[PDB]
Amino acid sequence: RRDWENPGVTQLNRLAAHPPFASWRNSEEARTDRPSQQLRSLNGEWRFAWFPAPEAVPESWLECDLPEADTVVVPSNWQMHGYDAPIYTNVTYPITVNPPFVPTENPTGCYSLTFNVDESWLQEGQTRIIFDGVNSAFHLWCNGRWVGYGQDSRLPSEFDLSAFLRAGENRLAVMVLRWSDGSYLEDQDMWRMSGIFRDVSLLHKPTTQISDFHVATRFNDDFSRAVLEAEVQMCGELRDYLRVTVSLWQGETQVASGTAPFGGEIIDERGGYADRVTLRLNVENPKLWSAEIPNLYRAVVELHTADGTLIEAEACDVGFREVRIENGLLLLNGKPLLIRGVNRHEHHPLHGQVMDEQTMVQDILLMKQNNFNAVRCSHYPNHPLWYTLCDRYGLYVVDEANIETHGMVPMNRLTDDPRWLPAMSERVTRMVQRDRNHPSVIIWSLGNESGHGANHDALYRWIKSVDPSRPVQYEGGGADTTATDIICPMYARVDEDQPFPAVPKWSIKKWLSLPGETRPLILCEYAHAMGNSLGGFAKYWQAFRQYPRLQGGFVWDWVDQSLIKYDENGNPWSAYGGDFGDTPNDRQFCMNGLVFADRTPHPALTEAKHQQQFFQFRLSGQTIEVTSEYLFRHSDNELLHWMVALDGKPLASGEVPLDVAPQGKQLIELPELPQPESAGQLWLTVRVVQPNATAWSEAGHISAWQQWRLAENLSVTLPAASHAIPHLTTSEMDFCIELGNKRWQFNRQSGFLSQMWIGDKKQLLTPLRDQFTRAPLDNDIGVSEATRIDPNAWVERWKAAGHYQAEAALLQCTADTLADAVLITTAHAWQHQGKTLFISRKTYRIDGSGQMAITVDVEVASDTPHPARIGLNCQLAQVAERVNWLGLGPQENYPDRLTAACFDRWDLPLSDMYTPYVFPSENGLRCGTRELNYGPHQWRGDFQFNISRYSQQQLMETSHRHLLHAEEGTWLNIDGFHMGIGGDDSWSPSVSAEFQLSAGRYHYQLVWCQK
Amino acid sequence: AALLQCTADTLADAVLITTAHAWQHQGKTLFISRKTYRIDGSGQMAITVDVEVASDTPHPARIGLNCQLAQVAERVNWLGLGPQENYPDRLTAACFDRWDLPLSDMYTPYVFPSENGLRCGTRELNYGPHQWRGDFQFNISRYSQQQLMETSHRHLLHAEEGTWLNIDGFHMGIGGDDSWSPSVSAEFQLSAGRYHYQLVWCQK
């Protein structure tokens, strides 16, 4: 029947979907969520064999183990074990588009397991198997007899094995298809893998059982009274002596309890549900659930007889909270949310798409630690434990159906086709059925990038109907269609409109007020964090805070989808699209996260943490005003530390308790500050510190900071005049300057500082020269490829204007002696095919003090694309251990991504001055630097710099970080000006005009000296 | 203007004067101006100016130079934005080209006198025998800034001897969203802390 090439057959013999069950036979266990003897795990060592197509599978395999099979761990993705290649493609389907057909060569994973079943499970009751995740479709047999079939790789498929097992050993056989008609609905932008990748379990339920239960919590107007409503359904034989008891506990205290026999109220002319009952429990003063304070109760559902015998118990954690949209705003417990969100895929560099509790916990802790309060399950229902952790740790979740048909043309070709309604329907209804009792889920999503089709509208309504408790969103077809309660665009810019036909991306501020519009706006994806990015992040946050209806967004995305590969030497390396021989592929486009695949943060994470702070500050005088952005909690685990320093020299500091109500203000007065010892800028830095450990942070965790310039006393003190005067030596070839142990050499034919000596040591490996380019960031490159050049990308514009190829032409090189110094004057023109791109005019003044002052004035032709940078660079002879500077830090920071950085004195090992992005590019800059120290050198002024063992040239010629090799010496890039890095998206120019180097004329000055 | 340094050096084809001043108030240094004046065998005087402004002092109205020229000429010819008065936050209507107007048109007769007549984005200014070149904003008239601020009605102003020239490297916006509270937008306030500008003064 080739059920896998028929969207009319998404399953065969599968059981109804339902919330997490465990069939406890002891109620106290159900109360405490302890392991149930009735829910067993089948994870571990299974038998597996790979075949190129289902037709190649031998019939012997149904009844007997194939001798050639290997033993492997389950769950797993077979690509991760090396049986075939994983493929990374973004939009284009990995298979020919010819629905509902799939290729005849269709990788087939034959899994089997021999396992025991105790007779006790078979004497009474029902034994079902549950496959939490099989990608993408499969047939199941038990003891050689066919049981059923299933699709939708991201929801559990359950089958009744009752009539198929026997006491003792039994053998399961699972034939898993890599491609199926379900693949047409699984076009997410991620690695394409397959296999039994989520848990496998066996659950015993009594014949008379709890088959479903839904929990709702409704409130009075001020939230001081709620009613907990639990609708309970059974399967099995109704009998008057049956009862259901629903009890509610807060910790170890029972808050309420109610019992009733089965029999629902009348629904229509034929009566009511004799097999259901609804219990209603009053709760006074409930402790409310939020991501700020995830208060939870425990609902325990007992099915039992009137005489008191328990049949079974099921249960769930309950979060008393209301979610509603009113007057244009999304409210949680009656207060408007400000979503500090992130999209997060289930990805692990070694295990592929297999998730584990440790990784889940690690992500959640980092998220909270970085001021995130919400996650979007891009773009499918997650492993069930995710929801439980979000309930308990506290994060708002957008749960999204596993439906994405991005590669179709037009994108809604399937979603507007009624023949595809059934399959889509199962992906939305089965999700709701499974996840509707989790308080962490606050919004349902109909999927991702599948255009807007009538199937969406029907499904949107179904949800609205079954679960009025949470809003429904969906971005396809323009982000504001009739299938979404929230305007939820992806990559809409703050101020700039992108009026694409049919599905324009309006500026978010403008979108809210279009004629007739009244919904809240929350970006489903924004601030594409690919590579060196997150430029302009603060512009979003400023807009979210000023506009009530701009309720935030989900950054794209949490973690790079890089995979580990091993070299000839067995050393691991981070790989991306095409590294597995996969083609076509979308290369590094799968790496867009705030963290590397191993969870090490990229530099952008600190920017997000700062902008997403929950405390806002203002300074007037020496009075700090702290405003809380929390909606429910008081600042009961926070103190404010303040420190004032003079050019990095600590002058004073203090601590003050913070006692701020949600939404309130606190005024703190700083102590009188004594006058500073010398000239310079005083800087105030404040930090919110949590003194006590929480479930998600260590004692001492810093959750917020801010800085301001205080008084500045400019220096007017004349410098003690040199006891020595430098000597110039003129030669045809060079101008040399000597001062004591120092010597400076300027080549007359190049017009550059070609060498410097300290004692008998040469200081340079390459001369000091102007630099106007950078090893292109992912955002500079966009969709440009050598085979498909995108002429609009910044990289292409620079390349085309000859910025990377320009050669310096000397216009002038002269020397003069002053009363106390030597002055070298140069002028160079960089040209390209007859065009003068830039002109650099400089003066170098070396005085009796040994300092070399460099003054630079650059002219940039108005008609050349604005350059990536304006600065100098050189390769120093030395390699030193530390980098010390007075400027913004400590982490990498760029013009449009420096708000999180603080001005102070920093000292790091040199390696920390290099950010190892997987795809190498310009990196490691630090801006607003007034003093930089390295080895015996010191540079002073007001510049941006980067320092590392890799030249810009090497960075731009290298595709993977693991192939980089340290150069001799150290590459210093010192810039007077640097362009923004952008990131609103990574496939179109996104650097805002204010961060482009369009001034035409630029001036900067550096002093180079000995430390 | 306290003098911090004033030197002279003789070069190959020129004389270089270097200066540094600090403007203070009550012992507080508000601004520091560092300059070099390079006079070459061509007779042109190149002035380079680097100013530092205390971060804690209110952002200043302008950063430039001024003098009262002996000369009174009939016309003002410039290559920059015009022909009418234009300020940083009010210059979109002005066009860049070569303008030439009578002196009096370089003064705007606001009934309540104030700074006025500025022209921005100027690359070359000609007046009498003088020529200034750079990338500056300027105003030129028979009235000093001092006289304008001390006079409440335009009919009371009197032409001073000669001509007052105000040449700025930078000038603050004029604002106007309202006229009773500070209204010049952040991007038009001179808050950069360090400012650089250069001009060449020559005859003809």
Ligand SMILES: *[C@@H]1C[C@@H](O)[C@@H](O)[C@@H](CO)O1
């Ligand atoms: C939004 C959808 C997501 O799956 C990615 O494709 C992202 C771009 O990397 O855009």
Ligand SMILES: [Mg+2]
């Ligand atoms: Mg099918």
Ligand SMILES: [Mg+2]
């Ligand atoms: Mg037991």
Ligand SMILES: [Mg+2]
């Ligand atoms: Mg047996």
Ligand SMILES: [Mg+2]
């Ligand atoms: Mg997509």
Ligand SMILES: [Mg+2]
């Ligand atoms: Mg390709």
Ligand SMILES: [Mg+2]
């Ligand atoms: Mg700040």
Ligand SMILES: [Mg+2]
């Ligand atoms: Mg214009």
Ligand code: NA
């Ligand atoms: Na808002």
Ligand code: NA
């Ligand atoms: Na991507």
Ligand code: NA
């Ligand atoms: Na506190």
Ligand code: NA
């Ligand atoms: Na590169």
Ligand code: NA
């Ligand atoms: Na006046």
